[PDB]
Protein backbone atom coordinates (compact mmCIF):
# COMPACT_ATOMS: atom_id res chain seq x y z
CA UNK A 1 0.00 0.00 0.00
CA UNK A 2 3.39 2.02 0.20
CA UNK A 3 3.86 3.24 -3.76
CA UNK A 4 7.35 5.19 -3.99
CA UNK A 5 8.60 7.17 -7.11
CA UNK A 6 10.94 5.56 -8.97
CA UNK A 7 14.46 7.46 -8.89
CA UNK A 8 16.74 8.68 -11.39
CA UNK A 9 20.53 7.95 -11.59
CA UNK A 10 22.05 11.34 -10.81
CA UNK B 1 32.03 19.29 3.66
CA UNK B 2 29.43 20.80 5.83
CA UNK B 3 28.89 19.41 9.24
CA UNK B 4 26.28 20.59 11.74
CA UNK B 5 26.43 19.58 15.35
CA UNK B 6 23.22 17.48 17.08
CA UNK B 7 20.77 19.88 19.43
CA UNK B 8 20.17 17.82 22.68
CA UNK B 9 16.91 17.77 24.73
CA UNK B 10 15.80 15.03 27.13
CA UNK B 11 12.95 14.96 28.45
CA UNK B 12 9.51 12.71 29.42
CA UNK B 13 7.00 11.82 27.16
CA UNK B 14 4.07 11.80 30.06
CA UNK B 15 4.27 14.50 32.97
CA UNK B 16 6.97 12.91 35.73
CA UNK B 17 5.48 11.34 38.66
CA UNK B 18 7.66 9.27 41.08
CA UNK B 19 6.73 5.99 41.36
CA UNK B 20 4.52 5.60 37.85
CA UNK B 21 5.84 4.25 34.17
CA UNK B 22 7.06 6.54 32.03
CA UNK B 23 9.14 7.03 28.60
CA UNK B 24 12.23 8.70 28.97
CA UNK B 25 13.27 10.34 25.49
CA UNK B 26 16.21 12.05 24.12
CA UNK B 27 15.71 14.01 21.02
CA UNK B 28 18.90 14.59 18.80
CA UNK B 29 17.83 17.01 15.88
CA UNK B 30 19.98 19.85 13.52
CA UNK B 31 23.08 17.69 12.62
CA UNK B 32 25.11 16.46 9.54
CA UNK B 33 26.25 14.33 9.04
CA UNK B 34 23.95 10.90 10.21
CA UNK B 35 26.31 8.90 12.60
CA UNK B 36 25.56 9.67 15.85
CA UNK B 37 26.12 7.91 19.04
CA UNK B 38 23.16 8.05 21.75
CA UNK B 39 23.07 6.40 25.06
CA UNK B 40 20.46 6.76 27.93
CA UNK B 41 22.16 6.56 31.29
CA UNK B 42 20.32 6.03 34.47
CA UNK B 43 23.13 6.81 38.00
CA UNK B 44 25.85 7.21 35.05
CA UNK B 45 25.10 3.28 33.46
CA UNK B 46 23.95 3.05 30.05
CA UNK B 47 20.75 1.67 29.98
CA UNK B 48 20.21 -1.13 27.90
CA UNK B 49 17.75 -2.06 24.96
CA UNK B 50 16.84 1.54 24.42
CA UNK B 51 14.92 1.88 21.21
CA UNK B 52 15.35 4.95 18.56
CA UNK B 53 13.71 6.01 15.66
CA UNK B 54 14.03 5.73 12.08
CA UNK B 55 16.67 7.94 10.94
CA UNK B 56 14.74 10.91 8.55
CA UNK B 57 15.39 14.76 8.57
CA UNK B 58 14.25 18.56 8.31
CA UNK B 59 13.06 20.36 5.23
CA UNK B 60 16.53 21.77 5.94
CA UNK B 61 18.45 18.31 5.33
CA UNK B 62 19.64 18.11 8.88
CA UNK B 63 19.11 14.60 10.55
CA UNK B 64 16.91 14.12 13.69
CA UNK B 65 16.17 10.26 15.84
CA UNK B 66 14.49 9.85 19.25
CA UNK B 67 16.13 7.56 21.30
CA UNK B 68 13.54 6.04 24.28
CA UNK B 69 13.16 3.69 26.66
CA UNK B 70 10.26 2.83 29.77
CA UNK B 71 11.55 4.41 33.14
CA UNK B 72 9.86 4.68 36.46
CA UNK B 73 11.41 7.97 37.94
CA UNK B 74 11.90 8.26 42.06
CA UNK B 75 13.17 10.74 43.49
CA UNK B 76 16.53 9.85 43.85
CA UNK B 77 17.45 8.28 40.19
CA UNK B 78 19.63 10.62 37.89
CA UNK B 79 18.59 10.27 34.23
CA UNK B 80 20.94 11.85 31.42
CA UNK B 81 21.69 11.19 27.51
CA UNK B 82 25.10 10.99 26.19
CA UNK B 83 26.10 12.22 22.66
CA UNK B 84 28.92 12.05 20.37
CA UNK B 85 29.10 12.94 16.65
CA UNK B 86 32.17 13.98 14.47
CA UNK B 87 31.30 17.39 15.70
CA UNK B 88 31.95 16.63 18.89
CA UNK B 89 35.66 16.76 20.41
CA UNK B 90 34.17 14.41 23.47
CA UNK B 91 30.67 12.71 24.42
CA UNK B 92 28.19 15.48 25.33
CA UNK B 93 25.99 14.67 28.49
CA UNK B 94 22.71 16.60 29.10
CA UNK B 95 20.92 15.85 32.16
CA UNK B 96 17.05 14.94 32.77
CA UNK B 97 15.60 18.15 34.55
CA UNK B 98 11.62 17.18 34.64
CA UNK B 99 11.38 21.22 34.53
CA UNK B 100 12.25 21.44 30.96
CA UNK C 1 -7.33 20.55 6.92
CA UNK C 2 -4.21 20.58 4.10
CA UNK C 3 -2.14 17.13 4.01
CA UNK C 4 0.86 16.39 2.58
CA UNK C 5 2.67 13.01 1.81
CA UNK C 6 6.68 12.94 1.62
CA UNK C 7 9.24 10.39 1.17
CA UNK C 8 12.47 11.20 2.96
CA UNK C 9 15.30 9.10 1.07
CA UNK C 10 18.98 8.99 2.80
CA UNK C 11 22.03 7.79 0.81
CA UNK C 12 25.18 6.98 3.11
CA UNK C 13 28.59 5.58 1.39
CA UNK C 14 30.97 4.00 3.78
CA UNK C 15 34.23 2.99 1.81
CA UNK C 16 35.33 -0.36 3.32
CA UNK C 17 32.49 -1.11 5.03
CA UNK C 18 29.93 -2.56 2.30
CA UNK C 19 27.82 -0.53 -0.12
CA UNK C 20 25.79 2.46 0.51
CA UNK C 21 22.86 2.19 3.57
CA UNK C 22 19.81 2.92 1.58
CA UNK C 23 17.13 4.25 3.96
CA UNK C 24 13.41 5.42 2.89
CA UNK C 25 10.76 6.62 4.89
CA UNK C 26 7.13 7.61 4.32
CA UNK C 27 5.10 10.00 6.23
CA UNK C 28 1.69 11.78 5.88
CA UNK C 29 2.13 15.10 7.86
CA UNK C 30 3.84 13.91 11.03
CA UNK C 31 2.74 10.66 10.83
CA UNK C 32 5.39 7.32 9.24
CA UNK C 33 3.68 4.97 7.67
CA UNK C 34 6.00 2.98 5.90
CA UNK C 35 9.84 2.44 6.16
CA UNK C 36 12.47 0.40 4.20
CA UNK C 37 16.15 0.27 4.70
CA UNK C 38 18.57 -1.82 2.65
CA UNK C 39 20.55 -2.57 5.92
CA UNK C 40 17.34 -4.32 7.63
CA UNK C 41 17.22 -7.58 5.74
CA UNK C 42 13.81 -8.00 7.83
CA UNK C 43 10.96 -8.54 5.38
CA UNK C 44 11.57 -5.45 2.95
CA UNK C 45 8.91 -2.51 3.51
CA UNK C 46 7.71 -2.44 7.06
CA UNK C 47 4.43 -0.67 7.39
CA UNK C 48 4.62 1.89 10.29
CA UNK C 49 0.88 2.97 10.48
CA UNK C 50 -1.72 0.28 10.80
CA UNK C 51 -3.76 1.62 7.57
CA UNK C 52 6.17 -2.29 -4.02
CA UNK C 53 9.37 -3.97 -2.33
CA UNK C 54 10.54 -3.69 -5.73
CA UNK C 55 10.78 0.06 -6.61
CA UNK C 56 12.67 0.27 -3.41
CA UNK C 57 14.87 -1.92 -3.88
CA UNK C 58 15.41 -0.69 -7.03
CA UNK C 59 15.94 2.91 -5.40
CA UNK C 60 18.68 1.45 -3.85
CA UNK C 61 20.87 0.40 -6.95
CA UNK C 62 19.62 3.69 -8.29
CA UNK C 63 20.95 6.01 -5.12
CA UNK C 64 23.97 3.80 -5.23
CA UNK C 65 24.70 5.10 -9.05
CA UNK C 66 24.28 8.65 -7.74
CA UNK C 67 26.61 8.72 -5.15
CA UNK C 68 29.40 6.91 -7.56
CA UNK C 69 28.38 9.56 -9.88
CA UNK C 70 28.63 12.53 -7.55
CA UNK C 71 31.69 11.66 -6.01
CA UNK C 72 33.13 11.78 -9.90
CA UNK C 73 31.61 15.35 -10.09
CA UNK C 74 33.22 16.87 -7.66
CA UNK C 75 36.61 14.85 -8.25
CA UNK C 76 36.52 13.19 -4.73
CA UNK C 77 38.42 10.40 -3.52
CA UNK C 78 37.27 6.99 -2.74
CA UNK C 79 38.10 7.10 0.67
CA UNK C 80 35.27 9.37 1.88
CA UNK C 81 31.40 8.51 3.09
CA UNK C 82 29.58 10.83 1.17
CA UNK C 83 25.65 11.63 1.75
CA UNK C 84 23.00 11.98 -1.00
CA UNK C 85 19.13 12.77 0.15
CA UNK C 86 16.05 12.85 -1.42
CA UNK C 87 12.84 14.46 -0.35
CA UNK C 88 9.82 14.02 -2.83
CA UNK C 89 6.06 14.51 -2.32
CA UNK C 90 2.72 16.15 -2.81
CA UNK C 91 0.45 18.56 -0.65
CA UNK C 92 -2.98 18.87 -1.21
CA UNK C 93 -5.56 21.44 0.17
CA UNK C 94 -9.12 20.24 2.08
CA UNK C 95 -10.77 19.28 -0.74
CA UNK C 96 -7.92 17.02 -2.05
CA UNK C 97 -6.92 19.18 -4.90
CA UNK C 98 -3.01 19.45 -5.50
CA UNK C 99 -1.49 22.62 -3.75
CA UNK C 100 2.43 21.07 -5.33
CA UNK C 101 4.90 18.79 -5.78
CA UNK C 102 8.27 18.29 -4.52
CA UNK C 103 11.23 16.28 -6.24
CA UNK C 104 14.71 17.61 -4.49
CA UNK C 105 18.14 16.53 -3.58
CA UNK C 106 21.18 17.45 -1.35
CA UNK C 107 24.54 16.48 -1.22
CA UNK C 108 26.56 16.14 1.96
CA UNK C 109 24.10 18.27 3.19
CA UNK C 110 23.56 20.79 0.62
CA UNK C 111 21.12 21.76 -2.23
CA UNK C 112 22.09 20.07 -5.44
CA UNK C 113 19.07 19.99 -7.49
CA UNK C 114 15.18 20.09 -7.53
CA UNK C 115 12.65 20.14 -9.48
CA UNK C 116 10.42 23.90 -9.90
CA UNK C 117 7.27 23.79 -9.01
CA UNK C 118 5.72 24.10 -12.34
CA UNK C 119 7.18 20.42 -12.48
CA UNK C 120 8.88 20.92 -15.86
CA UNK C 121 12.11 22.33 -15.25
CA UNK C 122 15.12 21.90 -12.80
CA UNK C 123 16.82 24.16 -10.85
CA UNK C 124 20.74 23.21 -10.44
CA UNK C 125 22.83 24.20 -7.60
CA UNK C 126 26.13 24.33 -9.37
CA UNK C 127 27.85 22.97 -12.50
CA UNK C 128 28.10 19.45 -10.93
CA UNK C 129 24.33 19.98 -10.69
CA UNK C 130 23.94 20.84 -14.41
CA UNK C 131 25.86 17.31 -15.84
CA UNK C 132 22.48 16.03 -13.90
CA UNK C 133 20.17 18.49 -15.51
CA UNK C 134 21.13 17.82 -18.96
CA UNK C 135 20.98 14.46 -18.21
CA UNK C 136 17.32 14.42 -17.07
CA UNK C 137 16.26 17.17 -19.68
CA UNK C 138 18.02 14.36 -22.33
CA UNK C 139 15.57 11.56 -20.97
CA UNK C 140 12.76 13.39 -19.99
CA UNK C 141 12.74 12.75 -16.34
CA UNK C 142 10.47 15.84 -15.22
CA UNK C 143 7.73 13.92 -17.01
CA UNK C 144 7.73 10.67 -15.37
CA UNK C 145 7.97 12.56 -11.67
CA UNK C 146 5.21 15.17 -12.88
CA UNK C 147 3.12 12.20 -13.72
CA UNK C 148 3.76 10.57 -10.36
CA UNK C 149 3.10 13.80 -8.29
CA UNK C 150 -0.35 14.55 -10.13
CA UNK C 151 -1.56 11.04 -10.18
CA UNK C 152 0.14 8.26 -7.69
CA UNK C 153 1.26 10.60 -5.09
CA UNK C 154 -2.17 12.95 -4.81
CA UNK C 155 -4.31 9.83 -5.29
CA UNK C 156 -2.76 7.87 -2.75
CA UNK C 157 -2.89 10.67 -0.81
CA UNK C 158 -6.71 11.01 -0.26
CA UNK C 159 -6.53 7.07 0.04
CA UNK C 160 -4.70 7.22 2.59
CA UNK C 161 -6.26 10.53 4.75
CA UNK C 162 -9.82 8.42 4.04
CA UNK C 163 -8.71 4.88 5.30
CA UNK C 164 -6.99 6.55 8.53
CA UNK C 165 -9.76 9.71 8.76
CA UNK C 166 -9.72 8.73 12.43
CA UNK C 167 -6.23 9.64 13.11
CA UNK C 168 -4.66 11.56 10.40
CA UNK C 169 -7.70 13.95 10.17
CA UNK C 170 -7.79 14.34 13.94
CA UNK C 171 -5.47 17.38 15.50
CA UNK C 172 -4.96 17.21 18.79
CA UNK C 173 -4.95 20.68 20.59
CA UNK C 174 -2.25 21.25 23.29
CA UNK C 175 -2.69 21.07 27.02
CA UNK C 176 -1.06 24.47 27.87
CA UNK C 177 0.33 25.80 31.43
CA UNK C 178 2.42 28.36 32.70
CA UNK C 179 5.87 27.58 35.32
CA UNK C 180 7.49 30.13 37.22
CA UNK C 181 11.04 29.28 38.89
CA UNK C 182 12.93 32.20 40.19
CA UNK C 183 16.38 32.83 38.82
CA UNK C 184 17.42 35.28 42.00
CA UNK C 185 15.97 37.67 43.55
CA UNK C 186 15.58 40.55 40.58
CA UNK C 187 14.00 37.85 38.13
CA UNK C 188 12.31 34.84 37.34
CA UNK C 189 11.77 32.78 34.55
CA UNK C 190 8.49 32.26 33.11
CA UNK C 191 7.92 28.84 30.68
CA UNK C 192 4.68 28.42 28.59
CA UNK C 193 3.97 24.93 27.83
CA UNK C 194 2.44 22.87 25.44
CA UNK C 195 2.17 19.19 25.41
CA UNK C 196 0.15 16.50 23.35
CA UNK C 197 -0.34 18.07 19.68
CA UNK C 198 -0.80 17.27 16.85
CA UNK C 199 0.52 17.56 14.35
CA UNK C 200 3.43 19.44 14.97
CA UNK C 201 3.03 22.83 13.51
CA UNK C 202 2.69 25.38 16.33
CA UNK C 203 3.06 28.96 17.62
CA UNK C 204 4.04 29.63 20.92
CA UNK C 205 4.66 33.55 21.65
CA UNK C 206 5.33 35.85 24.83
CA UNK C 207 4.28 39.19 24.80
CA UNK C 208 5.06 41.86 27.48
CA UNK C 209 2.46 44.69 27.81
CA UNK C 210 1.35 43.56 23.87
CA UNK C 211 4.27 43.63 22.70
CA UNK C 212 5.83 40.68 20.97
CA UNK C 213 9.36 39.90 23.34
CA UNK C 214 10.96 37.63 19.86
CA UNK C 215 14.40 38.29 20.44
CA UNK C 216 14.01 37.94 24.63
CA UNK C 217 12.21 34.36 24.68
CA UNK C 218 13.99 30.98 24.06
CA UNK C 219 12.21 28.22 22.45
CA UNK C 220 13.31 24.87 22.15
CA UNK C 221 12.63 22.99 18.63
CA UNK C 222 9.40 21.27 18.89
CA UNK C 223 9.90 17.47 20.12
CA UNK C 224 8.28 14.57 19.66
CA UNK C 225 6.46 12.45 22.50
CA UNK C 226 6.58 9.20 21.22
CA UNK C 227 3.04 8.86 20.98
CA UNK C 228 2.47 10.32 18.02
CA UNK C 229 1.74 14.07 19.84
CA UNK C 230 4.59 16.76 20.46
CA UNK C 231 5.81 18.82 23.02
CA UNK C 232 7.26 22.97 22.91
CA UNK C 233 8.03 25.42 25.56
CA UNK C 234 8.91 29.13 25.22
CA UNK C 235 10.81 30.70 27.98
CA UNK C 236 11.19 34.31 28.96
CA UNK C 237 13.14 36.29 32.17
CA UNK C 238 11.47 38.83 33.93
CA UNK C 239 11.55 41.16 36.50
CA UNK C 240 10.55 40.05 39.61
CA UNK C 241 6.65 41.27 40.50
CA UNK C 242 6.27 42.15 36.35
CA UNK C 243 5.03 38.75 35.82
CA UNK C 244 1.18 40.09 35.02
CA UNK C 245 2.47 42.15 32.08
CA UNK C 246 3.48 38.57 30.19
CA UNK C 247 1.02 36.52 28.33
CA UNK C 248 1.96 33.39 25.97
CA UNK C 249 0.00 32.90 23.04
CA UNK C 250 -0.53 29.74 21.20
CA UNK C 251 -2.14 29.07 18.12
CA UNK C 252 -2.93 25.14 16.52
CA UNK C 253 -5.32 23.43 14.33
CA UNK C 254 -6.86 21.74 17.29
CA UNK C 255 -7.83 24.72 19.19
CA UNK C 256 -11.46 26.21 18.81
CA UNK C 257 -9.40 29.24 19.61
CA UNK C 258 -6.13 30.71 20.27
CA UNK C 259 -5.43 31.07 23.55
CA UNK C 260 -3.67 33.79 26.07
CA UNK C 261 -2.48 32.26 29.25
CA UNK C 262 -0.44 33.72 32.23
CA UNK C 263 1.17 32.30 35.15
CA UNK C 264 -1.93 31.57 37.37
Redesign the interface.
Known sequence: ?10 | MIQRTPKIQVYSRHPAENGKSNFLNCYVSGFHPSDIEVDLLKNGERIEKVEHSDLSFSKDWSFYLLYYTEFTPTEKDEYACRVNHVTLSQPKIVKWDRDM | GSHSMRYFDTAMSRPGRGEPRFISVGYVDDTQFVRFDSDAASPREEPRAPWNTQIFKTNTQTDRCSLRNLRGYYNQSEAGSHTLQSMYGCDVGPDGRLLRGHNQYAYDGKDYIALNEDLRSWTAADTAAQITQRKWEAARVAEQDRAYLEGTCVEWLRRYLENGKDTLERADPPKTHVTHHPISDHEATLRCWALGFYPAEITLTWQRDGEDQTQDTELVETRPAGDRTFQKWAAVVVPSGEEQRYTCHVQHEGLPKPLTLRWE
Open positions: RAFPKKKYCL
